[PDB]
DNA sequence: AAAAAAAAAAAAAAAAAAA
DNA sequence: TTTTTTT
């Protein structure tokens, strides 16, 4: 599990991020480092909190974000060239070619 | 407490317990008949003006400097008082306590541990305040014919000068100066309420090896109210007040801007070309009978400083100089040496 | 005890009918209140009493009932209370307004004023008077007073009084239809409350004379007591003490052995003439009695003073959208050596003026962290304060150099913004500015330059309304005459007076220029830039700027303003434009 | 038991909900307003009405406006009842059931912080201050659906408190809610929630006392609608909160003086005191402090004005004249801005290389003329345009920085003064003074149009779309006219080439 | 069920200062 | 203008 910010170039200027947490199920470990820009497609649930009740006095919720895939984003902005999660990747095909 | 005293809404008579340690647990259902009926006859309060109480205090105290052996670190020892002896001692004095030296169990820390480990304290008996008593020059005939004394004696200011320090020779003008200090110049006001204060500003300056720091310690010992400083050591010296996150329960007690005891004290300072800027700051604040009003957390509680200013500084070469003066100075600000 | 229940009662209403304040004055030795109070209050619609105790005891059954009040405070003054309530009616004879209002006493002057470092427990349950500085406060808390429950299963709702905070919770719907045990259930919104509110209060520092530390003492107040003081207050409270065992474990049902002490206060107490205006502002010679009436002990100096008032008079401030706001205010500089008493100016308009922060060289806004609570609290700094009045600053040459930039900001916009911590806003200053500043060295040269002695930017010092500079020289006559006049003050003028004609000045007072002075401005601008030229080719400095323009728009605006006109006339502009000529003409370095 | 007050109150609502017919102007004989807002949530489905006061205030006069306004909170479920059956009587299709929601605003007065008193619970009331701190959006349960384990027995619309509630009884005859209880989160109701901070304005607060604080508590539609630093005007009803550490949870569980007006004696309690304070609860906030698509906004006025000033033929003949009325003289300066204000096209090539598409403009003069007047102008008009000084005592400069707690990770940055700047027009004052790091930034910045920095173990890309706007002084006073712009002003031969206008 | 925190040591970035 | 040192 990872905690996730917003990214420092798409928060309004003067703002304060946005925290979240990612759990990495198998086979997506240690995929994600330390102080890159990335982007996750994921499942978005809620869980109950005893604290979290304790300190706001309402039934509020946590949320997780379960990643299902990730995609490195660091330096390349450049992101209509082509589709999926790795454009320096090849195809066999491509290979031939 | 000493005896807790509780009411039932009309049980007859109201019952009464007596607690000796220092915590204990209260009543709920009283033992009269109407109540030892299945149910109660009204519920029971606990009353406080019917209870017992008594004026209770705590101190500690601290081994002297004579008594400890070589490479120790003195201890402590605390000290309960209860009574009409409360309030018969003062920090910072010294005395002989006669009292009971009793245990006290740990579980109020309530660690579970120390199984046979207890603590220990002392009961107040009966406290001799010895040191010595400043009589706010209380008029008796003693004294009375010893001014009659003084005033037989003819001349007394020379003689005084002559009295101060035998120890450091010569310096005959320092130390008359030294006495038109400890009389004070001319206060209580004018006309229009235009601010004048008795307070004499004087700086020593000199070479090392001249005594000045000496004779500023003779000074402070032959005046009731000298507090005396020197450069760093410490930070509370100035700008905080000495009750500062003081409490157990850390309440936070200030008075804001002040200094030690500036109302009608004697700042006596040594290395007056070594302190910071707060200090500096702190000292033209002090100026002419100007209080200090500086203020962190809303507090503006400010101390009235009229208080005698006397400081010994060196020069920044550690020697006279053949140029001039005035740029060689003390590195001090021009303002503050007028 | 059951003793002041019957006669007592009776007692104290017939001396409330019986008493006239001559008894009083007998006992000085140099009038029925209670009746014509108590009407008044029938025809105000008030709902309060002050009670006295010394005219109290100027009678001699009184007295008796005076030692049970100090033994027994609370029945007494409930009793006291019913005892008005009757008297409504009892004198009376609409009774409307009456049923609607409670009645409460306010007892004072019971006994000699006490200090915290004398405090015995022979003193519980006993009505003192102690008088101190409040230290701080306390957010309302809500107290309960009146339980709402509601039985869930047969929505069946109760209303159930309490006592001493403890509830007796019903252990059964009355609904015997249902009649189930287990359905009650409460609602917190729909109960009802009082406001209680926790003051810390300081003894005064007169009872610590030996250097120590003061102490403090926690106060309670109640209804119309609630925020009666704040921060820095100096008051005198009248109330019964109190002990209250404390918790300790909250988990556990012991108690400790000891009792905090806290005391319950129920009286506290702190420590047309605009015809008389026009008759004073109609006299010839206001100006000068006025400009010499603020700086009694000040010899000579007048044309600074003339100065300084006419700044705290101030000028006038408009809106017009075509073009934005103007400026109003008006800053002037002191400088000279540390021999003319300089900083007492700034003290005498400090207090003279309605509001205004005297500092010295952290004084704009900052956010800061909450020290007893752990929290954020935006605060906003001396200048800020400012607003619509005077800040005064001295040393001005120890300005560091990050506050500097600050000022640049605030002078030319009157408005400063702040993006720190996610906190984006502007906020508005709208102050006056007088400064003191001090020349390098023992002396300032006078055939030194202005700039280099006082070290400050070229721009700042340009962009000031006005400056004024003081230079002691040592002459035989001058000298005289200051000694001769120190020596006599230490061997016609008017009271807050001022206070009021200025604020009456300031804001019903809109005066504005006329066609006439707009040839005379011109004509002195056009005369000074004449003046600022000579026909040889030395190509001299532009000395008649843009803003001497504004300034004697300003000046002359701020000379209507005083006198109480509504227009400006020539002598306004004359003696606007000589003021601000004056200080040029000894503005001028060495040469020329 | 029927609350007949209750129902009489939610009697009167839909009735003048439904007819209260009120006339705009002479061409609208009758309106019906309410029924056009719920014709707008058919059209949009939308949730949340708005309910001006003032229309509420002659409507029965006291029997109804001061009875709603007062006890609220005892009278806010009838009222929701009355708008369910309206609106399922005209739209049953919109409830596809729907947490309808009421927001009343235009209230006769606004209380300030130091004026909130206990009485007044319950009741409607309008505060206005500046918020200071947000929280996150979080959901919470609104509507639960337990299941009694072992026999289903489905416990649904169950209500909930301050505290997690659960079901006290099992309706299946067999079962005897022995079993405990499962929540179904797919069927339970969530609903948005966000708490934030006030505090009194610098104009209410006497004296150098502390501000006074409270805490807001906002839901629905209503989020995200407070920015801090925004003094802000809301609406709502005035609650208390109790502390729920005391009160039964499944969890386990200045200040130190306690005095708290507790109460005890309860069940749940046992040997505890439950204390409270004082929150505020809001339903409607206010702040008071393609050409296609513009076409589309369509009126009388925008139709014939702006078609008059295209088919004009001295417009900008015209147009430069209208630039900064206030100042004299100057005629270029006036084009030069207008010209900076209309920008230039942004265009970017195939290859992810940006090409700069603004203008940037410097001013040249001798002090005390007009100078700061057309920067103070132009903050004045250009929308989202920003005002500063070269030298800022700020530590964030002009570029950037970056701001740490002691002993605190990641050095979260802080945006500096052209980072605000961005996605918007910049005007700087005072140029020529100018601190050598952040010009050598800018320098670089500006070709690139965006500022990067790296520092202590953390890295980050900024974005600074801005168009420059600056004033600077020669050397000397005055400019010489012997010399040139090189001889007369100090400032670096790269940064000239950047500004496109002198 | 809970000791939890003031006092130190060491690693930076920003600003201001001296050459 | 540059490097140093302090906060
Ligand atoms: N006039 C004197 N008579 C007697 N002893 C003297 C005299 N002058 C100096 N001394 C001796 O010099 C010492 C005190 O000088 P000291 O250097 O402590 O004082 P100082 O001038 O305030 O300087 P410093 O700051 O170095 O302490 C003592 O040992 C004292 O005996
Ligand atoms: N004209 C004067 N009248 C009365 N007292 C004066 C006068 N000039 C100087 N003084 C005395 O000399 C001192 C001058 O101090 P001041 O010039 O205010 O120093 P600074 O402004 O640097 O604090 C004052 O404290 C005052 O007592
Ligand atoms: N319409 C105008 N024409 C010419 N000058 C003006 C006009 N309006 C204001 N001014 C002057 O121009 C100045 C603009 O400020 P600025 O030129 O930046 O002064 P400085 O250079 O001293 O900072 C103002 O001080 C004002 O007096
Ligand atoms: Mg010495
Ligand atoms: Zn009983
Ligand atoms: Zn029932
Ligand atoms: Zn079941």
């Not at chain 2, 490479?71 to 920090?91: F, K, Y």
């Not at chain 4, 925004?230 to 208390?240: M, S």
């Amino acid at each position: 599990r990872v905690t996730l910010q917003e990214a420092p170039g798409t928060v309004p200027p003067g703002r304060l991020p946005r925290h979240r947490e990612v759990i990495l199920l198998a086979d997506l470990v240690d995929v994600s480092k330390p102080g890159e820009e990335v982007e996750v497609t994921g499942i978005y649930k809620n869980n109950y909190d005893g604290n979290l009740n304790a300190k706001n006095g309402f039934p509020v919720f946590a949320t997780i974000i379960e990643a299902n895939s990730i995609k490195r984003r660091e330096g390349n902005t450049a992101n209509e060239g082509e589709e999926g999660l790795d454009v320096f990747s090849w195809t066999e095909e491509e290979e031939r070619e | 407490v000493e005896v807790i005293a509780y009411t039932c809404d009309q049980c007859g008579y109201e019952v009464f317990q007596e607690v000796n340690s220092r915590t204990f647990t209260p009543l709920s259902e009283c033992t009269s008949e109407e109540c030892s009926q299945n149910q109660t006859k009204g519920q029971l309060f606990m009353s406080t003006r019917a209870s017992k109480f008594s004026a209770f205090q705590e101190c500690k105290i601290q081994e002297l400097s004579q008594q400890v052996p070589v490479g120790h670190i003195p201890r402590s020892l605390n000290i309960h008082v209860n009574g009409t002896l409360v309030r018969s001692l003062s920090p910072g004095d010294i005395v002989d306590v006669t009292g009971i030296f009793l245990p006290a169990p740990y579980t109020g820390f309530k660690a579970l541990k120390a199984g046979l480990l207890t603590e220990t304290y002392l009961e107040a008996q009966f406290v001799r305040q010895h040191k010595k008593k400043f009589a706010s020059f209380s008029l008796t005939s003693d004294v009375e014919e010893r001014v009659m004394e003084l005033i037989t004696s003819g001349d007394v200011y020379n003689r005084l000068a002559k009295s101060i320090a035998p120890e450091i020779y010569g310096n005959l003008d320092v130390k008359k100066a030294l006495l038109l200090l400890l009389v004070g110049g001319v206060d209580k006001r004018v006309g229009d309420g235009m601010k004048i204060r008795g307070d004499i500003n004087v700086c020593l300056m000199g070479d090392p090896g001249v005594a000045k720091s000496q004779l500023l310690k003779a000074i402070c010992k032959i005046s009731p109210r000298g507090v005396y400083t020197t450069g760093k050591g410490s930070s509370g010296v100035g700008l905080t007040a000495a009750v500062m996150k003081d409490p157990v329960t850390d309440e936070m007690i200030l008075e804001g801007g002040a200094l030690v005891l500036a109302d009608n004290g004697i700042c006596c300072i040594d290395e007056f070309d070594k302190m910071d800027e707060s200090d500096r700051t702190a000292i033209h604040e002090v100026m002419e009978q100007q209080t200090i009003s500086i203020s962190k957390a809303g507090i503006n509680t400010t101390l009235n400083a009229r208080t005698s200013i006397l400081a010994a500084a060196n020069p920044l070469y550690g020697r006279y100089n053949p140029r001039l003066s005035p740029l060689d100075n003390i590195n001090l600000p021009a303002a503050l040496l007028s | 005890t059951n003793v002041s229940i019957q006669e007592c009662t009776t007692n104290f209403r017939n001396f409330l009918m019986s008493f006239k304040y001559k008894f009083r004055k007998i006992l000085d030795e140099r009038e029925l209140y209670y009746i014509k109070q108590l009407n008044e209050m029938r025809e105000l619609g008030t709902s309060n009493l002050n009670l006295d105790a010394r005219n109290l005891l100027a009678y001699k059954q009184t007295e008796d009932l005076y030692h049970q009040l100090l033994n027994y405070p609370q029945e007494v003054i409930s009793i006291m209370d019913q005892t008005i309530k009757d008297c409504m009616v009892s004198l009376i004879v609409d009774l409307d307004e009456i049923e609607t209002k409670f009645y409460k006493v306010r007892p004072y002057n019971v006994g000699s004023c006490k200090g915290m470092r004398e405090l015995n427990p022979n003193d519980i349950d006993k009505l003192i008077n102690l008088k101190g500085l409040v230290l701080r406060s306390t957010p309302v808390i809500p107290d309960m007073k009146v339980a709402f429950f509601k039985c869930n299963v047969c929505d069946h709702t109760m209303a159930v009084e309490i006592d001493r905070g403890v509830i007796q919770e019903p252990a059964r719907c009355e609904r015997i239809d249902c009649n189930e045990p287990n359905s009650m259930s409460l609602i917190h919104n729909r109960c009802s409350f009082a406001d209680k509110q926790v003051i810390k209060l300081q003894e005064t520092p007169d009872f610590v004379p030996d250097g120590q530390t003061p102490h403090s003492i926690s106060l309670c107040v109640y209804d119309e007591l609630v925020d009666s003081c704040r921060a820095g207050d100096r008051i005198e409270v009248t109330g019964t003490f109190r002990s209250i065992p404390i918790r300790a474990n909250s988990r556990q049902r012991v108690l400790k052995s000891l009792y905090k002490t806290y005391v319950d206060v129920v009286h506290v107490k702190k420590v047309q003439d605009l015809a008389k205006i026009r008759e004073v502002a109609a006299r010839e010679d206001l100006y000068s009695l006025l400009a010499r009436s603020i700086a009694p002990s000040i010899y000579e100096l007048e044309d600074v003073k003339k100065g300084i008032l006419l700044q705290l008079f101030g000028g006038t401030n408009k809106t017009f959208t075509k073009g934005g706001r103007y400026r109003g205010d008006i800053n002037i500089l002191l400088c000279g050596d540390p021999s003319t008493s300089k900083s007492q100016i700034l003290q005498y308009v400090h207090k003279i003026t309605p509001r205004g922060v005297y500092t010295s060289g952290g004084l704009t806004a900052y956010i800061t962290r909450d020290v007893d609570t752990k929290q954020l609290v935006l605060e906003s700094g001396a200048l800020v304060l400012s607003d619509g009045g005077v800040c005064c600053i001295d040393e001005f040459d120890k300005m560091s150099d990050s506050t500097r930039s600050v000022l640049h900001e605030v002078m030319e916009q009157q408005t400063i913004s702040i993006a720190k911590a996610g906190i984006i806003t502007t906020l508005n200053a709208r102050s006056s500015i007088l400064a003191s500043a001090n020349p390098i060295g023992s002396r300032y040269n006078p055939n030194l330059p202005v700039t280099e002695n006082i070290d400050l930017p070229p721009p700042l010092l340009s962009r000031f309304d006005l400056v004024y500079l003081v230079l002691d020289k040592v002459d035989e006559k001058n000298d005289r005459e200051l000694a001769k006049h120190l020596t006599n003050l230490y061997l016609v003028l008017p009271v807050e007076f001022l206070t009021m004609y200025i604020s009456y000045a300031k804001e019903h007072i809109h005066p504005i220029i006329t066609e006439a002075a707009k040839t005379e401005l011109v004509r002195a601008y056009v005369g000074m830039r004449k003046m600022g030229d000579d026909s040889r080719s030395d190509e001299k400095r532009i000395t008649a700027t843009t803003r001497q323009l504004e300034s004697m728009i300003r000046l002359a605006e701020a000379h209507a303003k005083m006198k109480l006109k509504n227009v400006v006339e020539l002598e306004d502009v004359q003696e606007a434009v000589r003021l601000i000529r004056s200080a040029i003409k000894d503005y001028a370095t060495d040469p020329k | 038991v029927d609350d007949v007050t209750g129902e009489k109150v939610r009697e009167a609502f839909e009735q003048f909900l439904e007819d209260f017919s009120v006339q705009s102007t002479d061409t609208g004989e009758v309106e019906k307003v309410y029924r056009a807002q719920i014709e707008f949530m058919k059209i949009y489905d939308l949730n949340t009405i708005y309910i001006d006061y003032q229309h509420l205030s002659m409507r029965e006069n006291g029997a109804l406006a001061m009875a709603i306004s007062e006890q609220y909170y005892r009278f806010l479920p009838f009222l929701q009842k009355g708008l369910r059956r309206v609106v399922r009587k005209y739209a049953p299709e919109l409830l596809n059931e729907r947490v309808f929601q009421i927001s009343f605003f235009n209230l006769p007065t606004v209380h300030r912080i130091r004026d909130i008193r206990s009485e007044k619970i319950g009741s409607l009331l309008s505060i206005s201050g500046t918020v200071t701190r947000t929280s996150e959006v979080r959901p919470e349960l609104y509507k639960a659906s337990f299941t009694c384990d072992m026999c289903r027995a489905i416990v649904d619309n169950v209500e909930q408190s301050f505290k997690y509630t659960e079901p006290t009884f099992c309706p299946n005859p067999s079962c005897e809610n022995r079993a405990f209880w499962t929540l179904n989160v797919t069927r339970s109701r969530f609903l948005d929630w966000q708490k934030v901070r006030i505090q009194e304005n610098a104009n209410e607060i006497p004296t150098g006392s502390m501000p006074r604080t409270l805490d807001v508590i906002l839901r629905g539609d209503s989020v995200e609608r407070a920015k801090p630093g925004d003094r802000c005007k809301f609406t709502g009803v005035e609650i208390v909160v109790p502390d729920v550490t005391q009160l039964g949870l499944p969890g386990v569980k200045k200040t130190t003086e306690g005095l708290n007006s507790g109460v005890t004696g309860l069940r749940s309690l046992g040997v505890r005191d439950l204390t409270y304070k004082i929150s505020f609860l809001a339903c409607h906030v206010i702040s008071i402090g393609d050409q296609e698509v513009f076409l589309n906004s369509l009126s009388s006025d925008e139709i014939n004005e702006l078609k008059e000033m295209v088919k004009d033929e001295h417009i900008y003949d015209k147009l430069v004249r209208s630039i900064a009325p206030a100042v004299f003289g100057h005629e270029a300066v006036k084009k030069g801005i207008l010209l900076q204000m209309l920008g230039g096209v942004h265009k970017s090539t195939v290859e992810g290389i940006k090409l700069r598409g603004d203008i940037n403009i410097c001013v040249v003069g001798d002090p005390s003329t007009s100078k700061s007047q057309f920067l103070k102008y132009v903050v004045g008009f250009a929308p989202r345009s920003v005002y500063t000084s070269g030298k800022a005592s700020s530590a964030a400069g002009l570029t950037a920085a970056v701001v740490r707690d002691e002993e605190g990770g990641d050095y979260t940055i802080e945006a500096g003064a052209l980072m605000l700047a961005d996605n918007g027009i910049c005007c700087i004052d005072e140029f020529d003074k100018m601190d050598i790091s952040d010009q050598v930034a800018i320098h670089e910045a500006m070709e690139q149009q965006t500022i990067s920095i790296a520092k202590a173990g953390i890295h980050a890309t900024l974005n600074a779309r801005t168009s420059i706007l600056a004033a600077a002084n020669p050397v000397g006073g005055r400019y010489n006219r012997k010399l040139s712009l090189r001889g007369n002003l100090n400032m670096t031969a790269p940064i000239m080439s950047r500004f496109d206008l002198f």
